[PDB]
């Protein structure tokens, strides 16, 4: 963290950066309807609710 970021954290104490948002997003200038979702899970990994 740059020193100014340290001062900003000292003033407002919020700090939640354990994980980074690397998510799938609709590409820009694309509007549509989700018609199918498929989930592939490796053999030996917990299957989520979906």
């Amino acid at each position: 963290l740059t020193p100014e970021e340290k001062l900003l954290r000292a003033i407002f104490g919020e700090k939640a950066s354990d994980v980074k948002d690397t998510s799938l997003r609709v590409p820009n200038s694309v509007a549509g309807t989700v018609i199918d979702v498929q989930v592939f899970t490796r053999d030996g990994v917990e299957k989520d609710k979906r």
């Binding site: 509007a31 309807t33 989700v34 018609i35």
Partner: protein, 231 residues
């Protein structure tokens, strides 16, 4: 005289069918038939109010790109068929909900829609879908709105629950307009003319009401010239 003109009047309305009419305006002086005909055609073809289907909710359907058991058409084709529904909504309401429940084999048409009496279906023979099984059933909730012009679903300003399907709305009831200027037999003069406007619509709008609405729009837009000043 020279400075005073003869104002046209609505002399005849001929209703060939429910979706076809001829309207005759007489008398018209030289050149005024073509001027009024073109102005009225451009206003009628562009700026006539109407009512159109905007939202459809079908039970058990999440989006248009799907099928329903016992129905031969896809949901996309059903929405396309609903785009051709001719609905007249009573004045004072810009929004209405109608329902369509039908079970059993047969063509599901517009005459099977349940409406509250403020809605008139002009084409009850319009086919919406086909049910191909005795166990098949369909239950839609259709939303009809008043408007003007063409408002696609994308252009609508942006919660919407999943299942509600947006339909592109063509509000204008006028489909085709033609006009002719023929000779008029008035008193003794021969310079007068007669304007005949042929209107092919979807049956929702009356001919006389259409003519008066176009004339009102033209007069309101001409007021700015009649009061020319720097604004």
């Amino acid at each position: 005289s020279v400075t005073e003109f003869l104002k046209p009047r609505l002399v005849d309305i001929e209703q060939i069918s429910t979706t076809h009419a001829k309207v005759t305006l007489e008398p018209l002086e030289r050149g005024f038939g073509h001027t009024l005909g073109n102005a009225l055609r451009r206003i009628l073809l562009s700026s006539m109010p109407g009512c159109a289907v905007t939202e459809v909710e079908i039970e058990g359907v999440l989006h248009e790109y799907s099928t329903k058991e016992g129905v031969q058409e896809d949901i996309l084709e059903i929405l396309l068929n609903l785009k051709g529904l001719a609905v007249r909504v009573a004045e004072g309401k810009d929004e209405v909900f109608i329902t369509l429940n039908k079970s059993g084999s047969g063509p599901v048409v517009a005459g099977d829609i349940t409406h509250d009496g403020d809605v008139e279906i002009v084409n009850p023979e319009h086919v919406i879908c086909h049910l191909t099984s005795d166990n098949a059933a369909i239950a839609m909730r259709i939303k009809v709105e008043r408007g003007r012009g063409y408002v696609p679903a994308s252009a609508r300003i942006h919660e919407r629950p999943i299942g509600r399907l947006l339909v592109d709305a063509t509000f204008s009831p006028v489909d085709k307009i033609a006009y002719s200027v023929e000779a008029a037999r008035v008193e003794q003069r021969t310079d007068l003319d007669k304007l005949v406007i042929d209107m092919e619509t979807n049956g929702t709008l009356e001919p006389e009401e259409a003519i008066r609405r176009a004339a009102t729009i033209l007069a309101e837009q001409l007021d700015a010239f009649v009061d020319l000043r720097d604004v």
